[PDB]
Amino acid sequence: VSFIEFVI
Amino acid sequence: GSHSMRYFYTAMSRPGRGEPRFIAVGYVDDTQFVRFDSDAASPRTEPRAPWIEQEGPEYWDGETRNMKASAQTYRENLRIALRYYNQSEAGSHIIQRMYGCDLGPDGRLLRGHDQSAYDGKDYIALNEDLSSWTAADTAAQITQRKWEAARVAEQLRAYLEGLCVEWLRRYLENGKETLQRADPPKTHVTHHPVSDHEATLRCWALGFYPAEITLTWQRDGEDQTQDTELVETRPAGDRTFQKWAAVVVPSGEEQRYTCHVQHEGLPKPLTLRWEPS
Amino acid sequence: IQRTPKIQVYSRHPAENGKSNFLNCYVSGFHPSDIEVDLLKNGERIEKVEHSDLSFSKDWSFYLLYYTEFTPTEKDEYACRVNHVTLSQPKIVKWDRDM
């Protein structure tokens, strides 16, 4: 399962 | 043995040709199991291995929701990167991300990973402690400060030690007949004269899984590293891989050369020679 | 800033004339990801060609497998034609059944 993304 | 799960994300801007494209793939070891493409007619997380198909609608809906949201976040990240590098809105740029977990032979977390790149160059990486960051440049230091303030590393640590390992172990069980089966290489040596006094010996490995393999040529028992041509390991298209290694040798000296093959599917390393029968 | 593709052209199984097989063109080591790959039979573009989903290696360079079913013969020539921003003209790599 995938995880979330973060804004750079 | 040891196993890994990895997601690979690519986001590419294309000014004048719409919003950036986002592609995600997921692998267990050398087996792809999911994909997502924002340019698809109907973008969805889709299965790419037989053992993931049994996951229920909540799985596919949730992964699709997450990947769609990731695509939107990467569109913002591409805009931010332009500001961080003083770049114009006219060029095409790429952000890539790879993350996931490695398991040791006991099934416990060996280490976690989360790294990003901009235009093919390292940008930021989560350190092995799963608590601090290594930034490649002064732009990535801005991101590092932002992610320290938002406790991003702690969120990643919780995923990498928790869901990442738990789901990897589930995939390994559901896919055990393939993911937990090593296929050894089928090996042979071919001989191709180059001239009247030299010939190429080419050691072949075919049909093996996983992709990690070592092929080496020895002359009189000494490795010929600087004289061996070694092709990149390449996919056959049936899950297995292929590789070869070649040396040019003096005619009449062929029997002084041995090829050595190491692979997880072999009980013991193999030694082969050219067999002129 | 950019990396040019490595190209290998090969079959899924050892070639035997008259026996159906798969012709593969594996492009790797390139950046950025946009790339044009054609498989050729006697110089003509093969229409039914599939490719893998875009992924990349630990050094961030991309790789793709293009493939099509084919039945090799003694006389038919096969090749892969690759274009990429790093190339001033397309690169053609001929299939050699011993490579």
Contacts 24+ apart (CB under 8 A), B77-80: B77/A5, B77/A7, B77/A8, B77/B11, B78/B11, B78/B13, B78/B20, B80/A7, B80/A8
Residue closest to B209 by CA, chosen among B52, B8, B3? B3
Asked if C6 contacts C28 with a C-beta cutoff of 8 angstroms, the reply is: yes
Spatial separation of the C-alpha atoms in residues B249 and B192, rounded to whole Å:
10
Spatial separation of the C-alpha atoms in residues B248 and B234, rounded to whole Å:
22
The C-alpha of B254 sits at a distance from chain C's nearest C-alpha, in angstroms, of 19
Backbone angles phi, psi at B12, to 5 degrees: -130, 120
C22: β partners: C69
Q: Provide the 3-class DSSP secondary structure of residue C76.
A: coil
- Which other chains touch chain C, taking contact as 3+ CB pairs less than 8 Å apart? B
Residues of B in contact with C10 (CB under 8 A): 234, 242
Residue-range domains of chain B with CATH: 3-180 (3.30.500.10), 186-272 (2.60.40.10)
Residue closest to C44 by CA, chosen among C2, C20, C77? C77
Spatial separation of the C-alpha atoms in residues B5 and B99, rounded to whole Å:
8
Residue closest to B110 by CA, chosen among B169, B150, B25? B169
Spatial separation of the C-alpha atoms in residues B261 and B268, rounded to whole Å:
9
Q: Is A3 close to B69, i.e. CB distance below 8 A?
A: no
| Residue B59 burial (10 A CB sphere; 0-12, 13-18, 19+) | middle
The C-alpha of B202 sits at a distance from chain C's nearest C-alpha, in angstroms, of 9
Is the N-terminal amide bond of B267 cis, ω within 30° of 0? no
Question: Tokens in use for C61?
Answer: 């360079």
Spatial separation of the C-alpha atoms in residues B74 and B72, rounded to whole Å:
5
Residues of chain B in Cβ contact (below 8 Å) with chain C: 8, 10, 12, 23, 25, 27, 32, 35, 37, 48, 92, 94, 96, 98, 117, 119-122, 190, 192, 202, 206, 231-232, 234-238, 242
Q: Is B190 close to C65, i.e. CB distance below 8 A?
A: no
Asked if B149 contacts B225 with a C-beta cutoff of 8 angstroms, the reply is: no
Q: Is A4 close to B164, i.e. CB distance below 8 A?
A: no
Report resolution in angstroms. 1.4
Q: Which of B94, B232, B237 sits opposite C22 (nearest CB)?
A: B237
CA atoms within 13 A on the CB side of B43: 18
CATH topology of domain C6-94: Immunoglobulin-like (2.60.40)
Torsion angle of C-alpha atoms B72, B73, B74, B77, degrees rounded to 10 = 130
- Which are the contacts of B204, defined by CB distance < 8 A and separation ≥ 6? B187, B188, B189, B190, B242, B243, B244
Where helices occur in B90-234 by DSSP H, the ranges are 138-149, 152-161, 163-174, 176-179
Q: How far is CA B74 from the centre of its chain?
A: 21
Chains A and B touch (3+ CB pairs under 8 A): yes
Q: Is A4 close to B97, i.e. CB distance below 8 A?
A: no
Number of residues that make up chain C? 99
Asked if B89 contacts B82 with a C-beta cutoff of 8 angstroms, the reply is: yes
Between vectors from CA C5 to CA B116 and to CA C12, what angle results, nearest 5°?
A: 105
- Which other chains touch chain B, taking contact as 3+ CB pairs less than 8 Å apart? A, C
Q: Hey, CA dihedral for B156, B162, B163, B164, is it positive or negative?
A: positive
- Which are the contacts of B152, defined by CB distance < 8 A and separation ≥ 6? A6
DSSP characters for B62-96? HHHHHHHHHHHHHHHHHHHHHHHHT--TTS--EEE
Stated as kind and residue range, the H or E segment containing C24 is strand C21-30
- In single-letter form, the type of residue at position B91 comes to G
Spatial separation of the C-alpha atoms in residues B96 and B120, rounded to whole Å:
8
